[model samples]
Target: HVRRDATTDGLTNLANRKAFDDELDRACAEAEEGGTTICLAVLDIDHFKGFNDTWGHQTGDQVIRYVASVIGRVAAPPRFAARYGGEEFAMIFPREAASVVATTLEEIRVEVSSRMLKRRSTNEDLGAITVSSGFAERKPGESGHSVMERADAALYASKRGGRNRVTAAES
Candidate 1:
């Protein structure tokens, strides 16, 4: 119970950054030892701060919970997802191609974008919300941090490409 608490995000009830880091290190070593491919993805709710400012944090929290639920549902066993930071999430896919995983990430992006956010108290339409995601693949002997950097770079590219798309880092 205590271990679960340490690994989970209090707000979203998703695995936290520490959980992500530990899994990343383990994946890194596994890939190196097994000579397998690994894919890392980073997602950011586009203009998340603006969403919080406009809709208020209470509404923002609801949105976060919904997104986290979708992530949990989609990323089942063999795929691990975590809340990497405020308004950001990460996923680790074992033995997967970055390009292949990027397609699924786009599916997730669309899933979130398609939902309408409404205020619980007033039923006020909060407008369309979207996410931009980026993915990178890890090669044998590569550090997880380096893979994460690549994924982060691609995530910024998605934001630049219009804030509702998925991008994969170039090898």
Candidate 2:
């Protein structure tokens, strides 16, 4: 069994998928019980497979860590952020509205896309990194799985919108 302290992703040192799912379930439970507002954002880096194929695994990991650092800064306190899987990250905003959370995610999107990352060892430019996100507010009596499903769909919507954008689930 993995140690509790190993809840973090070994590469990015961010919360891992298990933590993300647990927190999301708990938040959905709280919101359903209390009628509180909560939002979930599913994010993925743009053209990640291309990057890995063009560069290398180590460079791809570099890009992942770079994105996670920006997310880490915003995910402090009551907000939860996690490395959901390869090139995908998830954020939970408990007691927050979709609009407000969207604005924050927009900031994150801009910040991530604003800079070009260089390879850690060689310092060679690797081009700009962009992220697409889909966020959904919990609907009445909605389960965590439903919210995540909506959020995941929204993420694809963002990608369809040309990437580096955040899309909100339709009510």
Candidate 3:
């Protein structure tokens, strides 16, 4: 259907940015009414542009697909996952505490950096790929866009502190 294609990312097969924006708004509204907590996380692959420049675009695609698979497993039904943009992904966890979401993100960060990636065509080693992530809890009377901005700011903090880490937004 038109809905499916329009909402899905072509490469990663995750929900696209449009889908994320809609879902985030819905989640925010629902949380406001139900008095439930929601958490939003933004994740980005470290040095992603370098991957493409060094290994070629296909290998870059491979890395993206691999990371998407990992993220998709964690972000199942009831929790929404999306490819926010190139080399970036986002997740929405409704009824979850920011602490819990941060724990999950930290686990993913460690796991991603623990393994080495290789070029499929030549089997050449490409070394490890790490990710940086940040999550923020929705504040009272906060808009989805506002929460997203805070989460993105935290993500930058993770990158600045060190790559391959997760950070929680400050109050």
Best by TM-score: 3
In model 3, pairs of residues that clash are none
Model 3, position 48: C-alpha lDDT score: 97
Q: Write the per-residue lDDT of candidate 2 for residues 1-171, one digit (tens) a residue.
A: 036466889888888999889888998888888878888999999999999998999898888988999999998869999999999999999887677898999999999999778887788899899999999988888988998999999999998889988899873
Per-model TM values vs. the true structure: 0.94, 0.94, 0.96
Instruction: Pick the lDDT winner.
Output: 3
Pairs with backbone N, CA or C atoms under 3 Å apart (clashes), candidate 1: none
Cα lDDT tens digits for candidate 1, 51-158: 789878988888888888778888886899999998999999998776669778988988898868789999999888888898988856679999999999999999
Tens digits of per-residue lDDT, candidate 3, 77-139, equal: 789999999999999999987778988898888778778888888989998999999999999
Off by over 4 Å in 3: 1-4
What's the lDDT for candidate 2?
Answer: 0.90
TM value for model 2:
0.94
Q: Which residue pairs overlap in candidate 2's backbone?
A: none
Residue 155 displacement (Å), model 2: 0.5
Worst 10 residues of 2 by lDDT: 1-10
